[PDB]
């Protein structure tokens, strides 16, 4: 049972997925190029066929509160993993 | 069962442990202020009473290979957690 952040890291590690999700090249920044495709694959992963970006974005919002991620200012689908002791702790536990 | 990197993160998060292990304030860098005390507490955690800094340093060496941590060049007891997609993937999986 993967957490959504783990699942995104696994998709980001394969450049074959770069058409729907990719590291932008700027540090730990990544873009949901096809956000509905990212949702569909998350749906397959968790056996939730009714998964959509609306549900996926609520999960990405929870990740700001934990300090794991931040939404890049001025962007609809660009986020970054945070590299600080708080993010590390939330990812470790 | 905690991994050594998780154990260090847990010790680092609690300022009660700051007399023997602490974040330096420079990004993800941390210092083993009392390296033998870190080693003794790792021993308590894993029920390995014969734990010492020698055994700990070799396990830290294994984490450099994984790509999760690195020893700060020119320092005896200063390390850092790595901020890159490879580190994130190794910590996630």
Numbering used by the authors:
A (entry chain B), B (entry chain A): 334 to 426
Original paper wording:
The Ets transcription factor family consists of 28 genes in humans containing the evolutionarily conserved 85 amino acid Ets DNA-binding domain, originally identified as a viral oncogene (E26 transformation-specific). The Ets domain is a variant helix-turn-helix (winged helix) structure, comprising three α-helices and a four-stranded antiparallel β-sheet. Here, we present the crystal structures of the Ets domains of the entire PEA3 subfamily (Etv1, Etv4, and Etv5) together with the structure of the Erg family member (Fev). Furthermore, a new Ets dimerization interface linked by a redox-sensitive disulfide bond is identified, and this dimerization is shown to result in a significant inhibition of DNA binding, potentially linking Ets transcription factors with cellular redox regulatory mechanisms.
Our attempts to crystallize the corresponding construct with the wild-type sequence failed, although the mutated residues are in disordered regions or at the end of the ordered region of the crystal structures of Etv1, so they are unlikely to have any bearing on the structural and functional analyses. Etv1, Etv4, and Fev display the typical fold of the Ets domain, which contains three α-helices (α1–3) flanking a four-stranded β-sheet, with an additional C-terminal helix (α4). On an individual residue level, the most striking transitions can be seen to occur in the recognition helix α3, where in Etv1 Asp-387, Arg-391, and Arg-394 can be seen to become ordered upon DNA binding and Tyr-395, which can be seen to switch between the two alternative rotamers found to be important for recognition of bases downstream of the GGA motif in the Fev-DNA complex. Dimerization of Etv1, -4, and -5 is mediated by the homologous cysteine residues (Cys-416, Cys-422, and Cys-449, respectively).
